[PDB]
């Protein structure tokens, strides 16, 4: 079993899905989280198995507030104390596959095949979405104040207080 190839194939499938329309409106989701997180989980999040984690996928346009070594802080709403989103390269675990539904455990004969595939796909996104975008920012593609179209995933624990900035893994990032 080749998890590197499998991941690359999932990524192509995910790219097609994002071209077709993927993610809830970022402002609506965050406003609902601020008002009523359980309603937000119900309306906007996926559950995998029977766990207490809630997997979100959002899309929108944000303004770059700060550029860091490991991501960008982005504002999607006005009048907030801190940026709404930290779009970072800190990609670990099953958040991408669980938020997107691109792969599930039942697709694999072994648990280790699922785990290695999730690792390979996180590598693709780290390198070819996030780190790639940070490099093109350094080369003049944008700066603080630029607008960025994004699709991003994040995971909440049921009953955890929402704290901003929400750290989210970007699946799509482009200057607008």
Return residues touching Cl ion (CB under 5 A): 110-112
Q: Name the minimum Å distance from CB 37 to Cl ion.
A: 27
Q: Name the minimum Å distance from CB 17 to Cl ion.
A: 10
Nearer to Cl ion, 110 or 158 (CB): 110
d(CA 148, CA 69): 17
d(CA 56, CA 95): 9
Q: Name the minimum Å distance from CB 62 to Cl ion.
A: 14
Q: Name the minimum Å distance from CB 172 to Cl ion.
A: 6
Provide the β-strand partners of residue 148: 62, 175
Nearer to Cl ion, 91 or 116 (CB): 116
* Angle at which helices 37-44 and 26-35 cross, to 10°: 140
Angle at 7 between CA 87 and CA 44, to 5 degrees: 45
d(CA 76, CA 69): 21
Nearer to Cl ion, 50 or 111 (CB): 111
Nearer to Cl ion, 38 or 101 (CB): 101
Nearer to Cl ion, 22 or 156 (CB): 22
DSSP 84-104: SEEEES---TTHHHHHH-S--
d(CA 156, CA 153): 10
Residue 174 structure tokens:
């482009």
Q: Name the minimum Å distance from CB 36 to Cl ion.
A: 29
């Amino acid at each position: 079993f080749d998890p590197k190839r499998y991941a690359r194939e999932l990524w192509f499938k995910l790219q097609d899905m994002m071209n077709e329309g993927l993610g809830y409106d970022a402002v609506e989701v965050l406003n609902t989280l601020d008002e009523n997180p359980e309603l937000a989980h119900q309306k906007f999040a996926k559950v995998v198995g029977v766990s207490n984690y809630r997997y979100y996928i959002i899309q929108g346009v944000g303004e770059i507030v700060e550029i860091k070594d490991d991501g960008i802080l982005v504002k999607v709403r006005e009048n907030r104390k801190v940026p709404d989103l930290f779009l970072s390269n800190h990609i670990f675990g099953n958040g991408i596959v669980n938020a997107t539904g691109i792969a599930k455990m039942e697709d694999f004969d072994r648990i280790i095949d699922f785990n290695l595939t999730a690792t390979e796909l996180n590598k693709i996104v780290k390198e070819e979405v996030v780190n790639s975008f940070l490099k093109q920012l350094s080369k003049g593609a944008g700066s603080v104040g630029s607008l960025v179209r994004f699709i991003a995933v994040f995971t909440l624990l049921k009953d955890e207080e929402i704290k901003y900035p929400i750290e989210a893994i970007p699946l799509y990032l482009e200057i607008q």
